[PDB]
Short mmCIF file of C-alpha atoms in Angstrom, two decimals:
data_model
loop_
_atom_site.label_atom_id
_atom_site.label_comp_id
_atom_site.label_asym_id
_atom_site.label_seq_id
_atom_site.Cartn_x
_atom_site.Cartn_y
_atom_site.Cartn_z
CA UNK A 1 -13.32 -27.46 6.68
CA UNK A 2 -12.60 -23.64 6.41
CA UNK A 3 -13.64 -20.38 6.93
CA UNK A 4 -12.29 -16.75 5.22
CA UNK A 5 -13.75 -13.97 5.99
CA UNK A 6 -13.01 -10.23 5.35
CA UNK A 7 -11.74 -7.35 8.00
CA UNK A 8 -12.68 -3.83 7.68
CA UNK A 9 -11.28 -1.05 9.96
CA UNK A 10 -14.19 0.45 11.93
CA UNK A 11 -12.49 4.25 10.97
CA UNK A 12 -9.49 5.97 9.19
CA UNK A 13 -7.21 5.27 11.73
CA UNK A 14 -7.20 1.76 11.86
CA UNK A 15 -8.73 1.59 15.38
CA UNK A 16 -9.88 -1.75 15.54
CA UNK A 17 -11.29 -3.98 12.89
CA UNK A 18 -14.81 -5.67 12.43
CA UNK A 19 -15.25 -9.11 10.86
CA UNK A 20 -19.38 -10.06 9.68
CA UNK A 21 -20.40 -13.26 11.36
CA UNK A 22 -23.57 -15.00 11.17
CA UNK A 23 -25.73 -15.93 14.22
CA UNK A 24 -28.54 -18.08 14.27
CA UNK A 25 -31.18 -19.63 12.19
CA UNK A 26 -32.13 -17.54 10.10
CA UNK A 27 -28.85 -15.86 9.97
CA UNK A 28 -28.37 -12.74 11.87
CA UNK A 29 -25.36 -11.13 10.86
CA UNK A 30 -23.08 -8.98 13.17
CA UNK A 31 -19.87 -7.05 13.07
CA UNK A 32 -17.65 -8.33 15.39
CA UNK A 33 -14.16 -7.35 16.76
CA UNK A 34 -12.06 -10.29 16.46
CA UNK A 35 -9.70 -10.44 19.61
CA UNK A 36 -6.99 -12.59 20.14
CA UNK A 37 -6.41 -11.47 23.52
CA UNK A 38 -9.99 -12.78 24.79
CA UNK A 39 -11.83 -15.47 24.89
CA UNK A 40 -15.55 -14.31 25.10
CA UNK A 41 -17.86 -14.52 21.90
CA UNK A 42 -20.41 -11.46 23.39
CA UNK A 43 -22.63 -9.02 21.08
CA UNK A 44 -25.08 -6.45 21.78
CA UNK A 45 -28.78 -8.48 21.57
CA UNK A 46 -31.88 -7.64 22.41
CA UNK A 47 -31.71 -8.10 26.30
CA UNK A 48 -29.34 -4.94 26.45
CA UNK A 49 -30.48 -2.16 28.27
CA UNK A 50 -31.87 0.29 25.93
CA UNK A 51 -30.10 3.16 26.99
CA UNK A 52 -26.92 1.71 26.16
CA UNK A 53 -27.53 0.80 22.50
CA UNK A 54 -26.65 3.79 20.52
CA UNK A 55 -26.62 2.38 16.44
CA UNK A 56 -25.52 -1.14 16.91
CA UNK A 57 -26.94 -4.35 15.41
CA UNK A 58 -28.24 -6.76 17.87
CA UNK A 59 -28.67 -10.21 18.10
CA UNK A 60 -32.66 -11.48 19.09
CA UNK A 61 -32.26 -14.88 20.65
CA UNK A 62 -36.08 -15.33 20.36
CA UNK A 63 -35.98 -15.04 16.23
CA UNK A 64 -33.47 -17.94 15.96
CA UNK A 65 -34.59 -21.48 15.77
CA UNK A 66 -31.30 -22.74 16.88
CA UNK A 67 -30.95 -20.84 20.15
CA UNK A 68 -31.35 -22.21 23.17
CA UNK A 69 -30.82 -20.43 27.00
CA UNK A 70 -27.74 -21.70 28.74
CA UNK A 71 -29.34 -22.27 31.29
CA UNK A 72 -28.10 -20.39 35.12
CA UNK A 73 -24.87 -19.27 33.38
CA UNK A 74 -23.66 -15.32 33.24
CA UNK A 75 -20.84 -13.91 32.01
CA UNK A 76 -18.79 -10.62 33.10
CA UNK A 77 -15.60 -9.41 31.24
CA UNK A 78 -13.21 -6.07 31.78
CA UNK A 79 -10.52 -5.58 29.66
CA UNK A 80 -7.42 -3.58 29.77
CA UNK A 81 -8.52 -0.01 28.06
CA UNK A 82 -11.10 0.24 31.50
CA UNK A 83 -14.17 -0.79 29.37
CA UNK A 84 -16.82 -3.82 30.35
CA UNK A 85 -19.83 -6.05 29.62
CA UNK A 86 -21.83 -8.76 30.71
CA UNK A 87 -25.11 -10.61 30.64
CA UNK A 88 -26.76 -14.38 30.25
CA UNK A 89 -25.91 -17.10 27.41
CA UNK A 90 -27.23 -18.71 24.69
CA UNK A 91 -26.05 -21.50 22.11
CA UNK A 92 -26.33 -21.11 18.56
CA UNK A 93 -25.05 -21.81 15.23
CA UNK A 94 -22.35 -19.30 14.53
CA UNK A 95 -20.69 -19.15 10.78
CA UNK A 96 -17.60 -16.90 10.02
CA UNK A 97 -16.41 -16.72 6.29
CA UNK A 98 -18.11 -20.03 5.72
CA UNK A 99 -17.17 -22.08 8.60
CA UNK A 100 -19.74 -23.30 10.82
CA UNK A 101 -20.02 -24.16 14.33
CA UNK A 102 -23.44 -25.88 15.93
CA UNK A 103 -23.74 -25.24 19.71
CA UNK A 104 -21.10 -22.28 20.17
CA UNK A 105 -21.71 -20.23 23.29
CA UNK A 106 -23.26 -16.60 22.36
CA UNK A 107 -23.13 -14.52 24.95
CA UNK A 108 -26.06 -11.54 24.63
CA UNK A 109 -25.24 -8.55 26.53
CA UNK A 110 -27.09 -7.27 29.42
CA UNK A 111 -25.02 -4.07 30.05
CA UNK A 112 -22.27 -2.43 28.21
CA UNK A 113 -19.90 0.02 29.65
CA UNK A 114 -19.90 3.44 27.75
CA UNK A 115 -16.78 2.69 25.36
CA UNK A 116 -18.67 0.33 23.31
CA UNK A 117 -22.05 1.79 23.17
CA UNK A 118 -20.18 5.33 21.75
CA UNK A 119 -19.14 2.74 18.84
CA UNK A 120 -21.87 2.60 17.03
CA UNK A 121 -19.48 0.39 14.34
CA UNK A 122 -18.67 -2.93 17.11
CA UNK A 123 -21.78 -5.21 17.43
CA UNK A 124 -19.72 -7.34 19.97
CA UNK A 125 -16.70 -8.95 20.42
CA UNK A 126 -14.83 -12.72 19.10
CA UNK A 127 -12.55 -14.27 21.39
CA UNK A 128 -9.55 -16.03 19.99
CA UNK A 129 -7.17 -16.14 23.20
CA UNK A 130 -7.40 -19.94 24.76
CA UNK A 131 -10.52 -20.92 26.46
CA UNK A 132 -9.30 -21.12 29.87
CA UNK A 133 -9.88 -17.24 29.87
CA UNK A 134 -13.52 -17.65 29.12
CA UNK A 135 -15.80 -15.78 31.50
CA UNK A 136 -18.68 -18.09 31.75
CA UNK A 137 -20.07 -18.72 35.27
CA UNK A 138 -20.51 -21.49 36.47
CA UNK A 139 -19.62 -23.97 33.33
CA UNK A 140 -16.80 -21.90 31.53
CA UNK A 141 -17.48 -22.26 27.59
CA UNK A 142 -15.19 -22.29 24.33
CA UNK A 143 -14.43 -20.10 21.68
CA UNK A 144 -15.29 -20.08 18.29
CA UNK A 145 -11.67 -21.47 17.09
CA UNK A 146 -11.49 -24.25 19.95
CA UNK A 147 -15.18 -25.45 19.00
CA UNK A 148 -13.41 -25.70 15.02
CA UNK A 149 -10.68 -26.63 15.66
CA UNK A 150 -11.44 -30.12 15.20
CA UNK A 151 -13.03 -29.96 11.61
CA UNK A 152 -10.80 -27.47 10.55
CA UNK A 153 -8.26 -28.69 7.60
CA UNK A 154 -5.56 -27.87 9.91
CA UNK A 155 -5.93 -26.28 13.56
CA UNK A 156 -5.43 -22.67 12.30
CA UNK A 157 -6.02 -19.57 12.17
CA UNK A 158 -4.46 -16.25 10.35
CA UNK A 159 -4.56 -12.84 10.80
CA UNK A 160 -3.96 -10.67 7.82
CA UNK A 161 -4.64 -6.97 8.93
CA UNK A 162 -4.85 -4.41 6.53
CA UNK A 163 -2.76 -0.39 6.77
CA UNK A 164 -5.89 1.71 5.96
CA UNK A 165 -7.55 -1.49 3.97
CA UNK A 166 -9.15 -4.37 4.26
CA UNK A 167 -7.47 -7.67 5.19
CA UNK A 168 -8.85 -11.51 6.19
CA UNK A 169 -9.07 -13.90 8.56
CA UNK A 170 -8.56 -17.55 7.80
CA UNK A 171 -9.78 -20.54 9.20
CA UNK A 172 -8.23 -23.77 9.05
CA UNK A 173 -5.62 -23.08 6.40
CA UNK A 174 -2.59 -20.96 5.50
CA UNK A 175 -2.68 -18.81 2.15
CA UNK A 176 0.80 -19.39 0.95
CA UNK A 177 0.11 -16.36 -1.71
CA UNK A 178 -1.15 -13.68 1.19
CA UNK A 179 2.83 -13.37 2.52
CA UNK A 180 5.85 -13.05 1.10
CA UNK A 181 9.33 -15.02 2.17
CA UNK A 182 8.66 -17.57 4.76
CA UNK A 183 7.16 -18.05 7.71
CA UNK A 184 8.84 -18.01 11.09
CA UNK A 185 7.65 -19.27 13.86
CA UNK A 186 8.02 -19.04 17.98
CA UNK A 187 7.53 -20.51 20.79
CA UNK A 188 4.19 -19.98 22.43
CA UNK A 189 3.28 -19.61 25.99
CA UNK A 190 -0.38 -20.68 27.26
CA UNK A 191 0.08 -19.97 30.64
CA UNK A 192 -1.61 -16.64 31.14
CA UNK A 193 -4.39 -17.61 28.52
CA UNK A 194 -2.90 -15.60 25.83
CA UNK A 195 -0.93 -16.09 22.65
CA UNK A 196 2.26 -15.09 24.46
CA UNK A 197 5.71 -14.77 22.90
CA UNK A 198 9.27 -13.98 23.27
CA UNK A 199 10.45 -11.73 20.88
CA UNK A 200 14.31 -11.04 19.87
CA UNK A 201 14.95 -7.44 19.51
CA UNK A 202 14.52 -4.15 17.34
CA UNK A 203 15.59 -1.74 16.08
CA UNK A 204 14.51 1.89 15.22
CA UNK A 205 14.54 3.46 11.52
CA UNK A 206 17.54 2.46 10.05
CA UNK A 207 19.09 1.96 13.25
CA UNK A 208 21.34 -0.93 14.53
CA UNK A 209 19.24 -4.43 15.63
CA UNK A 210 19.47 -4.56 19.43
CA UNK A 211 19.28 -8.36 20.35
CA UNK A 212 17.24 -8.22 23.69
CA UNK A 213 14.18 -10.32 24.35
CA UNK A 214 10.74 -8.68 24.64
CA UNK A 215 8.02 -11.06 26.15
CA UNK A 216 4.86 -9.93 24.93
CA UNK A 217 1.13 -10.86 23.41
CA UNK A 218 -0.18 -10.99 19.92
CA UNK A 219 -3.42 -9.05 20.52
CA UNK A 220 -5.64 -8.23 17.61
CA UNK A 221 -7.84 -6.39 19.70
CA UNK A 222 -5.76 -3.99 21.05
CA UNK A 223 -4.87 -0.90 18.89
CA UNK A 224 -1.59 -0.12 19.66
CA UNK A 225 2.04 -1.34 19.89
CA UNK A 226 2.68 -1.45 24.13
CA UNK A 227 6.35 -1.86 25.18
CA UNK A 228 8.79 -1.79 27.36
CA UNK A 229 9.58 2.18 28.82
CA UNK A 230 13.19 2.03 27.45
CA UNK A 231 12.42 0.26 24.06
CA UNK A 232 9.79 3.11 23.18
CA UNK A 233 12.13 6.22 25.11
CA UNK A 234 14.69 5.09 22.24
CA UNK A 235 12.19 5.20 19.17
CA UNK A 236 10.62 8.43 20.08
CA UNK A 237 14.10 10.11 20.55
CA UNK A 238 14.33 9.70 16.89
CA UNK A 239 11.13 12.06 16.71
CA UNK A 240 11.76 15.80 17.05
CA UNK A 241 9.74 17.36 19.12
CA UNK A 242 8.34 13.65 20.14
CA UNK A 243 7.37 14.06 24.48
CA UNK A 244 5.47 11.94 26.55
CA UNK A 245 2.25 14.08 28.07
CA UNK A 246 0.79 12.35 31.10
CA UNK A 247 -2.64 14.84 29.93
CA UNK A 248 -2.79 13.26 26.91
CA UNK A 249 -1.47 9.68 28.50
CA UNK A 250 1.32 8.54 26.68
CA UNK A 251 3.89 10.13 23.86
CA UNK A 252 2.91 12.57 20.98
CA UNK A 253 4.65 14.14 18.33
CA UNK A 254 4.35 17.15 15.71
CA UNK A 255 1.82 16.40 13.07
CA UNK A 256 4.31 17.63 10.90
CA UNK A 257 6.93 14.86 11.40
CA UNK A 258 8.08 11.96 9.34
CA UNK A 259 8.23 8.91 11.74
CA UNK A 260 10.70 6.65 11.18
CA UNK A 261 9.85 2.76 10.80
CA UNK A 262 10.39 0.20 13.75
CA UNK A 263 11.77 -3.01 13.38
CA UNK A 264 10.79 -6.38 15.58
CA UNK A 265 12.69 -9.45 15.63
CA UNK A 266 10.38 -12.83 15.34
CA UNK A 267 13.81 -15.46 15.89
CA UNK A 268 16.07 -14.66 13.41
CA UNK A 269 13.31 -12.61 10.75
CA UNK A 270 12.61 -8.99 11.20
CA UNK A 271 9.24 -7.50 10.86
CA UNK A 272 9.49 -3.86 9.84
CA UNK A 273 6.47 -1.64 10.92
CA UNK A 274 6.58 1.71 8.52
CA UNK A 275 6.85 5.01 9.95
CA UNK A 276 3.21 5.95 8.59
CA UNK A 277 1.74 2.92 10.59
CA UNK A 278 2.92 4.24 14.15
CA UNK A 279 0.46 8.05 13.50
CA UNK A 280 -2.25 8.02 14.85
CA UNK A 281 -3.41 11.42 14.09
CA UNK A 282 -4.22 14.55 15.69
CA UNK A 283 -4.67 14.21 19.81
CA UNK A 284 -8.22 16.35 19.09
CA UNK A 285 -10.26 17.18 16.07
CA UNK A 286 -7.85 20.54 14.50
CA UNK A 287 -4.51 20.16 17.12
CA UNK A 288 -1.01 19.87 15.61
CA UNK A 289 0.09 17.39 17.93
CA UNK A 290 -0.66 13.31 16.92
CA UNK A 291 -0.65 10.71 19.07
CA UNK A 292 1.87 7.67 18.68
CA UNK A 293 1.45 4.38 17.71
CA UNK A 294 3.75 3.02 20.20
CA UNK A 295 3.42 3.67 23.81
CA UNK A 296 4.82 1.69 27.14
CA UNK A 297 3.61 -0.77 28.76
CA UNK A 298 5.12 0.31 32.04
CA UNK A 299 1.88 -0.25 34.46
CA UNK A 300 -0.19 -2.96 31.97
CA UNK A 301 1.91 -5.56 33.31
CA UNK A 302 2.46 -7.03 29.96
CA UNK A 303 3.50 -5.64 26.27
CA UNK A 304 1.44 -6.16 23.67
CA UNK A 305 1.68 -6.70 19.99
CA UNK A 306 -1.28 -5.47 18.99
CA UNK A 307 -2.56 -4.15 15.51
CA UNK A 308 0.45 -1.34 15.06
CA UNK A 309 2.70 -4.57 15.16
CA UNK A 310 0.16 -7.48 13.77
CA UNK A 311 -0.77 -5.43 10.84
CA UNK A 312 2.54 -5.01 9.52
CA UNK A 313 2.72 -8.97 9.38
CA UNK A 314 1.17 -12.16 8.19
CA UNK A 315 0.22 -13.92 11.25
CA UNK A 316 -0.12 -17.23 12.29
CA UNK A 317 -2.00 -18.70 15.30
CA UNK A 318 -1.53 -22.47 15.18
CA UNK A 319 -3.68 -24.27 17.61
CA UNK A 320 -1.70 -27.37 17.18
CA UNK A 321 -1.17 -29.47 20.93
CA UNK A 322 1.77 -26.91 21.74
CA UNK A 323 1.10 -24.04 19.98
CA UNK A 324 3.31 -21.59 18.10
CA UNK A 325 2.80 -18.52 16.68
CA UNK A 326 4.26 -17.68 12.44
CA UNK A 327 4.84 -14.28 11.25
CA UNK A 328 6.10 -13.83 7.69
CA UNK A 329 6.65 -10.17 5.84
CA UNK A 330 3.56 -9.64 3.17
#
């Protein structure tokens, strides 16, 4: 089997992405945020407390013929921007682009944390890390991919994130006309319960390629591109005017600038993001000063490669027995 399924950005900024998936019998369809740095399958439902649903579509276990109470088993997630949820558990039939999984562990909301009721565009959340960062208390569950993975044509998935567009996610397959070039692929480590790479450098605008490695995470749900202090010092030196504000928490730059592009190496290939991918507009509704696409990690604990970096790629997440991770240019 497969699945392909289209992702919109949620605003003009590219701020996350939301993916419809169907829940239940009959369907109930949701916009989720597809994260491949979690492993939690969680939407707003009808057991979250009023007060904290501000526009979103919710799941009602009790109008699907399919779902069934898990029973004694709770869930509680925080992720790295501050913002949580949590709840109870059902199982139900969940379908994304096609693809169909009986018995996958939906986990309905109890309380959200004020980040995701304030967007009114995220129904939940679809975890694509590896399971073993499931939540689930006291029988830890799978996600959506895992529960596939065996049906699937091949134990795949891509990530095809639009600049200021639409893109897809694909199930089970590669779409050898969605890239250009090849594909290169990396080494993958599980052992934190993320997609976790090694990359081999960068380099700045049209700058020399400094070979150094950069272990990071390919995170789909995480806005921006988090890296080392010196790696980003040396980009935004190539900004005028470009200063890190500890009020505004982390580097900004004139609205009037051109940024230049930044370069990643995957092995021997090069991913080049474009300058216009790293603005993120103005710090507040009318100010001249934008906020930057890259930032440090220096105090996350980890870099991430998230949609700054992922968008500028076509992105493999093979869930072969060791798993790698492909990026080709598109």
């Amino acid at each position: 089997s497969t699945g392909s399924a289209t992702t919109t950005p949620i605003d003009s900024l590219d701020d996350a992405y939301i993916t419809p998936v169907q829940i239940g019998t009959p369907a109930q369809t949701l916009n989720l945020d597809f994260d491949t740095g979690s492993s939690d399958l969680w939407v707003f439902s009808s057991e979250t407390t009023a007060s904290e649903v501000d526009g979103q579509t919710i799941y009602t276990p009790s109008k699907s013929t399919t779902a069934k109470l898990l029973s004694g088993a709770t869930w509680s997630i925080s992720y790295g921007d501050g913002s949580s949820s949590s709840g109870d558990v059902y199982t139900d039939t969940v379908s994304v682009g096609g693809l169909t999984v009986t018995g996958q562990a939906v986990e309905s909301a109890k309380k959200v944390s004020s980040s995701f009721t304030e967007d009114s565009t995220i129904d939940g959340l679809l975890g694509l890390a590896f399971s073993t960062l499931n939540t689930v208390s006291p029988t830890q569950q799978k996600t959506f991919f895992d529960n596939a993975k065996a049906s699937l044509d091949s134990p795949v998935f891509t990530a095809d994130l639009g600049y200021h567009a639409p893109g897809t996610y694909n199930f089970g397959f590669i779409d050898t006309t969605a890239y250009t070039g090849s594909i290169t692929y990396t080494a993958v480590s599980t052992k934190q319960g993320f997609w976790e790479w090694t990359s081999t450098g960068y380099a700045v605008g049209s700058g020399t390629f400094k070979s150094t490695s950069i272990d990071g995470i390919a995170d789909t749900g995480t806005t921006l591109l988090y890296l080392p202090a010196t790696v980003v010092s040396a980009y935004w030196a190539q900004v005028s005017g470009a200063k890190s504000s500890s009020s505004v928490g982390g580097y900004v730059f004139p609205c009037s600038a051109t940024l230049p592009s930044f370069t990643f190496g995957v092995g021997s290939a090069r991913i080049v993001i474009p300058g216009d991918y790293i603005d993120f507009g103005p710090i507040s509704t009318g100010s001249s000063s934008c906020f930057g696409g890259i930032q440090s990690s220096a105090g996350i604990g980890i870099n991430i490669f998230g949609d700054v970096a992922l968008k500028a790629a076509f992105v493999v997440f093979n869930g072969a027995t060791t798993p790698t991770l492909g990026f080709a240019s598109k």
